[PDB]
Every structure is written in C-alpha cells, then in structure tokens.
C-alpha cells in the first residue's frame, strides 16, 4: 500500500494517523515533580544507538526490513543527519531547488534512510493508558511500522509527529521501523537558504498518558493599565471518559510559594446554540503585583495543571513556565508591558559544524550567552520552528523570540506560485497551526511569523487571520510580497537601507525612514533581516542604529545572521578544515553564500561582533565640558549591576582614571562630574574612554563584564618644538641603475628603472623582499564580489567593475625619477602612471626625504581618473624580510576595523601577536585592517602618520587566489599594506554594491604622508 | 452550491444570489466543535475555495456565504479572509456564532424579530431595529432567514416590511423557505400522497419540519 | 488499497487525483459558437441509463464488478438519488446527525451504490488532447475506476469532481 499511494508526492496528504499537536507534555503522576520540572518516568527517551541502512529509493527497500533487522545495516547515533555519517552528500543551494521544480513530484532517485530500533516496553505501560511515540524532527517525510505493522506517515521537518502505539506494542521486545525520505512534496515548502540534509535529526521519545488525560492547555495573562494587577487564564482540555467526580486544579508558583490556585469540574461556558464544551474548563487566577517577564528581567512563575478526582486522587499533571508579559501594537508602536521595544536582534539557524542540524543544550546555551554578552535581546527562528528546548532556554535566560513557520518557497517562479494556490493551503496551514499549538505557552515567543520568502499569496492572508483569531496575545508578521502586505502587523523588510531607496518593481525596498511615512502607513518597522554579515562585513552598521534611536517607529531588526553554516571536513592528514557549498561534490551549489555569520561555526567571533555589541549598547553617553551624561535605554531595570570606569590618556599614556557607581532608572539620566584634570606639558592628543562594567556575575555574564563603552577627544597640544638639530648628512650616490643613500649603517636604494625603493639595509641585513610600491586594489571581500547565487554575475559588482577597468592588471609606468641633495637631507622625487589599454587610471607623485636622523619622510599625491571606478584603496605595499613576534600600534583597535566599521574600535596603544592581525575568514579576502593609526611598530621598523594598515604572512595576491583559508601558506617575511585611504566594506546586502557614497574613494585627488624610521 | 444552470438562469432572468459553501455542522456539541478545529480547516477550505473558483464569474452572485449553522470557529475567520483577498468584488456573510461575528460583512441573523429581543446566552437574537444601533455597530442587516413559512404561517410578515422600509440599514431578508420538502408516496390504489419525516420507516426523524 | 486506506473516514483526504476547480468550460473550437452559447461537440452528456447495484457496505462489493457487469444490477436513470428508486430509505432529520457522532468515523453498515456505464469515444479524442470526466454532484463520496483501473476519489456532494481519463481510455467500448 505504502509504495502504491506515494504519499510523499501528494500535498493533500501531509500525514496519516498522526495525533493532534499540543504544548510540551510529560504526564507527571506527582504534582511536586510537575512543579519542579524534574524528569518524568512517563516520558521515555529513545535517543542513542539505532540501526540504519541507506537506499537510493524507497523501491530499493527490502520487505524483510519491516520484520527483521538488515545485516548490511550499521549501528548509528540518533538523532543525526545521515549526511553527517557520510551516507550521501549534504547539498548547499540558496534559491534554486535541489530537485527539479515539478510539484508535487520528486526525483525517482530519492535517498531513503531506513531506521530501526529493537527495544523493551514495560508491563505497566500496556496494562493501562495510552503509549505514544514522538518524533521531534524527521527530514523530510517518513513512514512508521511497529512490529511489522504499518502505523502512520508524517511531513514537516521541524515539528513533532506523534502516533499512538498502544495497540501495536507488546510486553518484552519491540521493533520500530522508520523509512525516511529525503525528498517529498514537503520539500517544496522547505527551500531555506541552508544545507539540504535529511534523517531523524531531533529527539525520539515514548510518552505514557492515562486514557483520561489532559490533551491541551492554554495559558494567558491579562493586565490592568499599570500592570499592578493580572489575571492568569488557563483553558484545559481533556480526552477520555467524562465523569462528574473529575476536577482540574491550576496552581501558580513563585519558587516554593503558591501564589494562586483554582479548582473546577469540567464544563465550559455556553458558546453557541448547541451549548458549550463539556470536555473543557477554564480556570481564572487573580495575581496582585506580578513580577513581569522581559529580556531585561526574565521573571518566571510555574503553572501546574492537575487532572484529579473530587476526593483528591491525582490522575496526571502537566506544567509550564509562565512569564507575565503583554505584547501589543498601539499607535504604531510595538509595546512590551506598555513600553516601546528596541529590538537588538539576530537571525539564528540550527547549525553545528560536526553534527549538522542536530541541536544540543550546550550549543544552545553557548549561543544564548554569547548573544546576551554582545547586547542582543532578540532572536528570529530562521526559518522554522526550533528544537523545543530553545524556547525553554529563551524563557529562562531572557530573549524575545520570533517563532516562524517552516514555509519557504523561494525557488518558485513567481515566488507566490504555491502560496497563492488553494491546493497548497492545507499543507501550509499545518505548518502554521501546529507551530502555534506547540509554542503558544512560551513567554519568550512575542511574535508569530508565517514563514520566509514565499511571496504573498491568499494562503498567507487566510493563515494570518487564523493566528489573530486563535492567539490575540501576539502580533503576526511576514515579509513576503514587499514587507508591508495585509498579512503583516509589522513592516518587516529584509536589507532595506537606511537612507537609500531600492525601487524594485512590485516589491520595492524603500529607505526605512521613508517607508514609515508613506501615505496611509502607520505600522512599526522592524527589519526581519539586515546588515548581512558575510565575511568582512557590517560596514554601515552604525547608520542603522542612529536611525533606530532617532525614529520612534523604527524599532530595530534582526542581523543576518548568527553563525556561519560551514561544515568540518578532514584532509589527508586527518586535520579538520571548514568547508562550504561544493566541497561535498554537491552540484549545483552556491559556494560560500552559506557563511553569513557574526561568529564562526565553532562560535569564535568574527570582528563584526564587537561592532554589533557597541552599536547595541544599552547606555548612551554625552560629554559637555567635564560632565558625562549617561542615559539608560532599559525599559524596566535599574542599573543595579553597573559601574562606570573612566580613563584619560595622552597618546596611549595613562594620566588619570576613576570609577563611579551608576544609579540610572530605566530611560533615566545620570550626570557624572569629572574631577580636575592635570595639564600635560607634553605634546599630543588627550583621549577620554568610558566603560560600563558589571561587577557581579549573572546567569549570562562573568564578573567584570564590559557592556558599553565610548570615547571622546579632549584637549590637544600640537608640537611646536624643533627636533634635535642633526649635523650628520645622508650621502647620495648616483649610478645608471640606482640612487643610493647612506647614513651610518643604513642604506636606501631606489631603482632608477622602476622608480621604487627596491631595497634598504641595516648593517648587512636587507629589509625588503619586494620593493615598496603603490597599491590601489584589495583581495575582494564577499561584499565586493556581490553574488548570492553562484550562476549570477553582476557587472555592477565592485570586483567586476575593478576587473573590467584593469585595476588588477594595471602597469606602473615611470614618468619621473630624480635625486637632489638638500642642506641636511637627500630628496628623491618620483612620478608613476598606471595604465590599462592606453587609459591612465592613477598617477602617483612622491617625494622621499631622508634626513640626518635616519628618518625617511614619504609624501604621496595621487590622481584618480574621474571616470574609472573608485579604487579599493590608496596606499603602499611591500614584503618585509623580517618576521617579528608582536605588532604594536597607536590607533583604532584592538580588533580589525574599517572606515564604515570602526565605531567599536578605540584609540589607544595596542600590542598583539602577529597572528591576531590576520582574520581567518573561511573565504579569504582583504582582512585585518586597522584604521586611524598614527604610529606602527614591527621589529626594527616604525611608521608614523595618519594611516590604515594591515600586516600578515599573506599577500593580497595569495588571498585573492585562494578559495579556502586552510589552503593558505605563510609567505617569506611579512606583507605590509599601509593605506592613506581605504574604501568602506559595505554589507547592507552582499549581492549588490552596498558601500555608501561617503565611504567611496571619489575625491579624485588624495594626499598622504608617512615617516619610516628605525626604532 | 447549486446545480450550475441555476446561476445561468439567475444571470438571465435577474435575481440576486447568495452563493453558500456546503458546510453545516449543526449536530455538533457545541456547534463550532469542527469549525474551530484546525484539523478540519483543509476539508472546510475546499468547500469554500472550490465554490468561489466555480462561480466567481456569475453576475447574479452578489454575496458569498461561509455555510450555515456551524457555530463560529477560527476556520471561519481564515476562510472569510481568503475570500476577501481573492475576490474583493463581493461581500462575505456568515450567520454562525451570533450573526455579527468577525466572519461577516453583514449582520445576517435568522428569525430575529422586529421589536422583540430574544436574549439567548452567547448568541442573542436582538430585535433587528435594536441590533443596528448596538454600541459600535455600523453594518447592514439582512436576515439570512426570517418569517418561517411552516404550514399556516407568515403571521406578522407586514411587520418586517414596515421596518425594512423605515430603517435604511435594514435591507431585507430571505424567507424560510420556498418549497415544501414533501415526497410522493403511493397508497394501495396507486394514488399519490405527500409524505414527510418518518413515512419511509426512517427513524429518528423530525416529521413535518421538512415542510 | 481502496478498502485498506478508508479515505471516507479521513478528513485529511477529501480527494485523490482530482483536477483543479474552474468556471464552466465547453472547449469550443469555434469562436462564434462560444459567443452564442451553442452546444459544444467537446462537451458530451453521459446522462441517461446506467447500470446500478446497491450494497449494505463497501466490503460487500465484489472485485468482479471492477471489470464485469453484475448480473444482479438494474438499469437506472442517472442523475438520480437511489432512495427515489427505492433501494433504501431517505431519512429526514433536522439537527441530529443521521449517523453516530464519532468523527471522523462512519457506520460500518454504509449503503453503497455501484454505478457503471459502457461507452465509446470519438476516435479523434483518443489521438490528441485531454478527455476528463465531470461529476457535477455525487452524494456523499466516491471512488472511480475506468476500464478496471483506479482513477481517483472525491468528496463534497455539491461541487463538481473532475478527473483526467486520458491515460485510461481505449478504442471501442470503455
Ligand atoms: O533573503 C535572505 O537573505 C539571506 C542571505 O544569506 C538568507 O538567504 C535568508 O534565508 C533569506 O531570507
Ligand atoms: Mg504528501
Ligand atoms: Mg531564501
Ligand atoms: Mg565612538
Ligand atoms: Mg475523507
Ligand atoms: Na526607534
Ligand atoms: Na546565505
Ligand atoms: Na550600580
Ligand atoms: Na579569496
Ligand atoms: Na431599509
Ligand atoms: Na425545516
């Protein structure tokens, strides 16, 4: 029958014999155990060692497997994705479906996972009651057999499928047989931009319930105007035989303290002409001065639901955590407990580099801690309901959650082809309705989402309305079809820019500031996706945050995204390396486009994370004279775990410091008067740095945690004193090939054929492996490349424009190279032209002045043709002969920073090991730049000026020629790139030019100056 | 939905049509037991959607109806919204759950009286004149059923029409109903007679209430 | 398979292999006839005499009926309600369901009407295009076979159920 019906090629069949969805159950038979959330003996985990065999199609499955274990089968760990055990390849594709687009059909070659378990069932479980099996996650469809007899079928990879096994199980040993299909008609609704995997990848469990049971319960909290009074409303549904002696008690607990309790017999109020629900009861509990739940303070109560007899015998108990909070939109603002939210959000996929899409508590907690530590307060479940434990953790740790249906149909043409089709309404409905049924009691869930990138169809409008009717407590959002359709309560665009319109036909992305005020528009705006964090990215992040703070109805957004979707592979020597699309022989694939995270796959941060942390700070600072004004952005909490530390330094040299307690009410201000500052007689810039420090450890942070910082320039004293008068004068020698300059043990050589400084000597040691030359290019960032699909090349992309203009192949032509002797120095004057096909792209004019103190002053003046694309950088590069242990600089740091991503960076004296000056982006590019630098030290060398730099063992050439970081080899000596000017990195999205105009190198004429000396 | 020729005849002769989904769950306790259940949303959806797909080009159809006597469930709200999104050209009405729910553009009660209130719990039938002016109410009122014409009946029919003419927002109603549901049986002589509930050995039955 | 799946006791299955709904079609191959709403040669009525047999339950239907006319069958006019031909009793109930309220299940004794028709098709229809069958009203659910091969399943007694017969039709009598 199973093979004949082909239920996996029919969207009209999404299940057979599947039980109703419901909130998490455990069927406790002891009230205290329900209260304390202790493990229940009635809830049996079947996780661990299962038997598994791979087949190319369900037709290839032998009949004998239904009754008997296959000898060719292996023993594997469950939950798992079978791609992670090497049975077939994980496929990375973004938009294009991994299967031929021919709904509702899937390939005849359909990887089939045959799972089995032999297991014992106790006597007591079958004597009475109902034994069900629960599969929390099976990708993408499966049939189920128990002891050789067919039980049921399930679809939707991201929600639990449950089946009653009572009549199938026997005392003693039993065998389950699960045939998992990689492809089904469900796959048409699962086109998320992620690895395409399959298998039993979430928990498997048995649950025993009495025949007379709690089948559903809903918890609601409503409030008065000032939240000083609440009513907890608990609707309880039963299954089994209704009897007059049956009662429900709902009790509410704050720790060990019962705060409220109510008991009633079954029988709801009259709802229509036929009466009411005889099998339901609603308990209402008064709560005075409830402790309110927020991300700031995640106050929780425990609700216990007891099904019992009048005389007091417990039948069973269910329970949940309760957070007293109200979510509403009013006058265009999203309010939490009456106060307007500012969403510091991030999108987060369920991804592990070893285990694929199998989640575990340790990874979940690691993520939550890192999120909160970097000033995030919200997460979007992109793009499916998560592992059930995720919501529990967000309840307890305190994060706002957008719970999103497992519906994405991105690869359809047009995008709404399935979602506007009433034939697909049933399958879509189940993915929405069963999520709401499961997750509705979690306080952390504050908004429901209808899915992602499925256009806008009438099915969306139908399901939007279903949620509004069933759950008035939460707004509903959905971005498809232009982000402001009738199926959304919140304007929720993806990658809409701050100031720049992107007027695409039908689905424009307006400037967020403009979008709010379009004629007739009143809704709040929270971007479902923004600041695409792919590789060297997050340029322009501060622009979003400035706008969020200025505009009441701009209530934030969710960064895309949390973690790179890279997977571990091993080389010939068993060494692990980070892989992306195409690395598993998967084709077609979209290469590195799965790696868009603020953190690496192992949760090591990319440099962009610190920019996010800084911009998302909860304290804002102003300086006027000697007064620091601290403003709190918290809505609920006082600053009762915060101290402000301040420091004044003169060019990195500490002059004064101090600490002041912070006592700031939510949304309040505090003024801190700085004490009298000493007046430094020395020349240089005074800088003030302030930091907010949390002295006490929390559930989410260590003692001493820095949560906020800011810097200001104070007084500057410009140097007017003459440098010590030299009497030594450098000596010039002119040959046909070279200008040679000598002073003591130092020699400088300028090649007269090339017009570059080709060598320097200190004693007998040469200092250069390659000459000091101008550089106007960078190894392209993912943002420069500007591709979201491997097939699609955009001629507008920065890399394509640079390549087409000849930037990467431009040849230096010598125009001038002269030498002169001054009264105390030798002056070398040079001019070069970079040309391509007869077009002069850049002209560099330089002077090198070498004085009696051994300092080489380099003055650079660059012309850039107004009709050539604006260059990636304007600077010099060379390969130094030296490798040295440390890099020491006075400038912005300590982490990697770029012109449009440097607000997090602080001006100070920084000293790091060389390897920290390289950022190991999995796809290599220009990296490790530090801006606003006045002095750089490396071995015997010092450079002074006002420049940006990077320093590493990898040349720009090698970086642009290498696709994977593990394939990089350290070159001889050290590559130094010192820039007068560097182009922004952009990142508003990574598939179109995204560097804002003010960060493009468009001035035409540029001036910079450097001093090179020996320290 | 009717035999397809009905709509053609209504187009050509000229009659306004309320086209109604084949959904009635009257015998459920409570009435909305299936219609508030998401498991029943797919079955219900097809009864609504496939009607609209079939009949949307008929000018005689001026109003869609979500069915009859199925309480008010969340499935009703979902399908109301589906129709509004797909076909803006016609109002959507539905009487279930008290005749004035979020699933209806028209206050559309059955057997609400002209002056006399019937304050049933949860689903009151207010006087039609009173109903219009309930705090916040703005909708038109057209009875989906009124003046029950069972046997010697239609007493007080003139009361409705006087009210309909006097009150702008009272825009009429549909009499229940057109034709006796009697069936022909034959006696010992072969002579025809009109039969009702119970006459075919059918039991339980509701006797003459079909006429 | 048909008896095993019990599609008539599952609200998750309201049809199998049924074509999309649509406004009234006639597939005119002449524009003027379309304008004047004249009979279309591509729209054929199968109304008239069919063969019919009544059974107390679907389990009682012999496998032989799928390919062979039952000797006990009668000739009846279609369209019709089989109560009006006297095969079983029509039931008048107002509110109370005529069956035990136990969703999604129905009584084991479930009156079953077995309709059949043998017919030929224009040769040109066997050569190109798509021939579908249209059941404007079947109360309350039905399975359909063509030339002994299962075609599909439909529910909702008041809207047309349509199925593609293209791959089932043969020369001569079907
Ligand atoms: O538009 C999007 O941007 C991301 C690009 O990495 C990713 O594809 C998300 O799933 C999608 O919603
Ligand atoms: Mg299917
Ligand atoms: Mg997508
Ligand atoms: Mg700053
Ligand atoms: Mg069915
Ligand atoms: Na704002
Ligand atoms: Na991506
Ligand atoms: Na404090
Ligand atoms: Na590269
Ligand atoms: Na009127
Ligand atoms: Na009647």
Swiss-Prot record, chain B:
Induction cue: By allolactose.
Cystine bridges: none
Effect listed in the UniProt record for changing residue 209 to A: Decreases the stability of the loop 794-804
Positions that bind Mg(2+) 2: 205
Entry annotation: catalytic residues: 69 (proton donor), 145 (nucleophile)
Residues annotated as binding substrate: 69, 145-148
Residues holding Mg(2+) 1: 24, 26, 69
Binding site for Na(+): 209
Superkingdom, natural source: Bacteria
Signal peptide: none
Subunit structure: Homotetramer.
Family note: Belongs to the glycosyl hydrolase 2 family.
Name of this chain's protein: Beta-galactosidase
Originating organism: Escherichia coli (strain K12)
Underlying gene: lacZ
Shown residues in whole-protein numbering: 394 to 604 of 1024
């Amino acid at each position: 029958v199973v093979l004949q019906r082909r239920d996996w090629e029919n969207p009209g069949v999404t299940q057979l014999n599947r039980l109703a969805a419901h909130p998490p159950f455990a069927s406790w038979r002891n009230s205290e155990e329900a209260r304390t959330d202790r493990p229940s003996q009635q809830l049996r985990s079947l996780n661990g060692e299962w038997r598994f065999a791979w087949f190319p199609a369900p037709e290839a499955v032998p009949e004998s497997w239904l009754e008997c274990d296959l000898p060719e089968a292996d023993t594997v760990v469950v939950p798992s994705n079978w791609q992670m055990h090497g049975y077939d390849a994980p496929i990375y594709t973004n938009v294009t479906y991994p299967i031929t687009v021919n709904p509702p059909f899937v390939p005849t070659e359909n990887p089939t996972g045959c799972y089995s378990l032999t297991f014992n069932v106790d006597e007591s479980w079958l004597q009475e009651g109902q034994t069900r099996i629960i599969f929390d996650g099976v990708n993408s469809a499966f049939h189920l057999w128990c002891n050789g007899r067919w039980v049921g079928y399930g679809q939707d990879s991201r929600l639990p499928s449950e089946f009653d096994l009572s009549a199938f199980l026997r005392a003693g040993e039993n065998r389950l047989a699960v045939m998992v299909l990689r492809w089904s008609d469900g796959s048409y609704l699962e086109d998320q931009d992620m690895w395409r995997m399959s298998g039993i990848f979430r928990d498997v469990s048995l649950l025993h319930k009495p025949t007379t049971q709690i089948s559903d319960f809903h918890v609601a909290t409503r409030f008065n105007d000032d939240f000083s009074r609440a009513v907890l409303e608990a609707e309880v549904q039963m299954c089994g035989e209704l009897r007059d002696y049956l009662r429900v008690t709902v009790s509410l607990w704050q720790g060990e303290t019962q705060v409220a309790s109510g008991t009633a017999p079954f029988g709801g109020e009259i709802i229509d002409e036929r009466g009411g629900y005889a099998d339901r009861v609603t308990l209402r509990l008064n709560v005075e001065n409830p402790k309110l739940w927020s991300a700031e303070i995640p106050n929780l109560y425990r609700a216990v639901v007891e099904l019992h007899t009048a005389d007091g015998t417990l039948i069973e108990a269910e329970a949940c955590d309760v957070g007293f909070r109200e979510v509403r939109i009013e006058n265009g603002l999203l309010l939490l407990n009456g106060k307007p939210l500012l969403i510091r959000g991030v999108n987060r996929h369920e991804h592990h580099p070893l285990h694929g899409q199998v989640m575990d508590e340790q990874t979940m907690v690691q993520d939550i801690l890192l999120m909160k530590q970097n000033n995030f307060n919200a997460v979007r479940c992109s793009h499916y309901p998560n592992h059930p434990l995720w919501y529990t953790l967000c309840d307890r740790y305190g994060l706002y959650v957008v719970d999103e249906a497992n519906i994405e149909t991105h690869g359809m043409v047009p995008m709404n082809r399935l979602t506007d089709d009433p034939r697909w309404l049933p399958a879509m409905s189940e993915r929405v309705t069963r999520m709401v049924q499961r997750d509705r009691n979690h306080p952390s869930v504050i908004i429901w989402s209808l899915g992602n990138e499925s256009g806008h169809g009438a099915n969306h409008d139908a399901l939007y309305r279903w949620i509004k009717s069933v759950d008035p407590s939460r707004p509903v959002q959905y971005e498809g079809g232009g982000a402001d359709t009738t199926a959304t309560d919140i304007i929720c665009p993806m990658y809409a820019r701050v100031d720049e319109d992107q007027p695409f036909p039908a689905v424009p992305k307006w400037s967020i500031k403009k979008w709010l005020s379009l004629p007739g528009e009143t809704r709040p705006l929270i971007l479902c996706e923004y600041a695409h964090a792919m590789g060297n990215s997050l340029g322009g992040f501060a622009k979003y945050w400035q706008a969020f703070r200025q505009y009441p109805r701009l209530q934030g957004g969710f960064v895309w995204d949390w973690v790179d979707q890279s997977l571990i592979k091993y080389d010939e020597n068993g060494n692990p390396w980070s892989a992306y699309g195409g690395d598993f022989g998967d084709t077609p694939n979209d290469r590195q486009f799965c790696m868009n995270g603020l953190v690496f796959a192992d949760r090591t941060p990319h440099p962009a994370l610190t920019e996010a942390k800084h911009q998302q700070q909860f304290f804002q600072f102003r300086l006027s004279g000697q007064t620091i004004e601290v403003t709190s952005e918290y809505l609920f909490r006082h600053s009762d775990n915060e101290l402000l530390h301040w420091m004044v330094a003169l060019d990195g040299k500490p002059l004064a410091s101090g600490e002041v307690p912070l006592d700031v009410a939510p949304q309040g201000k505090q003024l801190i008067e700085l004490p009298e500052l000493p007046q430094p007689e020395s020349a240089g810039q005074l800088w003030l740095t302030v930091r907010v420090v949390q002295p006490n450890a929390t559930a989410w942070s260590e003692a001493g945690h820095i949560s906020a910082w800011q810097q200001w320039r104070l007084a500057e004293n410009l140097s007017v004193t003459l440098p010590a008068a030299s009497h030594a004068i450098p000596h010039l020698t002119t040959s046909e090939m070279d200008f040679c300059i000598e002073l003591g043990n130092k020699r400088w050589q300028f090649n007269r054929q090339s017009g570059f400084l080709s060598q320097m000597w200190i004693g007998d040691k040469k200092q250069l492996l390659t000459p000091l030359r101008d550089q106007f290019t960078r190894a392209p960032l993912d943002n420069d490349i500007g591709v979201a699909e491997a097939t699609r090349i955009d001629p507008n992309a920065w890399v394509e424009r640079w390549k087409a203009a000849g930037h990467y192949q431009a040849e230096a032509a010598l125009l001038q190279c002269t030498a002169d002797t001054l009264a105390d120095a030798v002056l070398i004057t040079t001019a070069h032209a970079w040309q391509h096909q007869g077009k002069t792209l850049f002209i560099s004019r330089k002077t090198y002045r070498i004085d009696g103190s051994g300092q080489m002053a380099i003055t650079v003046d660059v012309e850039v043709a107004s009709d050539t694309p604006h260059p990636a950088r304007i600077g010099l590069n060379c390969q130094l002969a030296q490798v040295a242990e440390r890099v020491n600089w006075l400038g912005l740091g300590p982490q990697e920073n770029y012109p449009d991503r440097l607000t997090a960076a602080c001006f100070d004296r920084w000293d790091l090991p060389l390897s920290d000056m390289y950022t190991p982006y999995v796809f290599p590019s220009e990296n490790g730049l530090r801006c606003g630098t006045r002095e750089l030290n490396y071995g015997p060398h010092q450079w002074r000026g006002d420049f940006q730099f990077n320093i590493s063992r990898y040349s720009q050439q090698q970086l642009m020629e290498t696709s994977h970081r593990h394939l990089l080899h350290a070159e001889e000596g050290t590559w130094l790139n010192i820039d007068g000017f560097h182009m922004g990195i952009g990142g508003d999205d990574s598939w179109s030019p995204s560097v804002s105009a003010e960060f493009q190198l468009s001035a035409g004429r540029y001036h910079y100056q450097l001093v090179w000396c020996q320290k």
